[PDB]
Amino acid sequence: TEYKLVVVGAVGVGKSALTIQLIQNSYRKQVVIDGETCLLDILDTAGQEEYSAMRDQYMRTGEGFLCVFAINNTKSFEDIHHYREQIKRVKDSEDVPMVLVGNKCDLPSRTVDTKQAQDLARSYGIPFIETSAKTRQGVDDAFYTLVREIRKH
């Protein structure tokens, strides 16, 4: 079973870092989730967001999305609304398989507490997982829970 996953968010939150830790610990990896074998294709959104007809098609191919923000970056958490609206615009659907991800949870200095992001994901109706690409904590959980949400819908 094939799964197209797209990782979006502000620049510097660790989207690329989370992708590398998943794959190489290439943008493809075969894993087993809930006793079911999976083929994961990851779209690591590089550069900054811009208007592009073909970029939309690249995101429209995605079946699951990771809204990644940094726990030490306030703006990256404020832009979560912006990225979600973009996804629902391209996918043309209000309910899109999505997971809110708070990266850099290893850092002791935090500007976005867990409860704030816990309420946001709760209002969206999506799961929330704190991740750390530096310590590999919650990395697999974030991508695998995303596949769970796709299977849910």
């Binding site: 943008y27 493809r28 811009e50 592009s52």
Partner: peptide, 30 residues
């Protein structure tokens, strides 16, 4: 930065690997 072509004898899995590479490349250079 562009991923090289898989070849004429590339298997389906070799195509899936390439497609994922071309997926990120085409997005980045947009």
């Amino acid at each position: 930065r562009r991923p090289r072509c898989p070849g004429d004898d590339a298997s389906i899995e070799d195509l899936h690997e390439y497609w994922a590479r071309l997926w990120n490349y085409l997005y980045a250079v947009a």
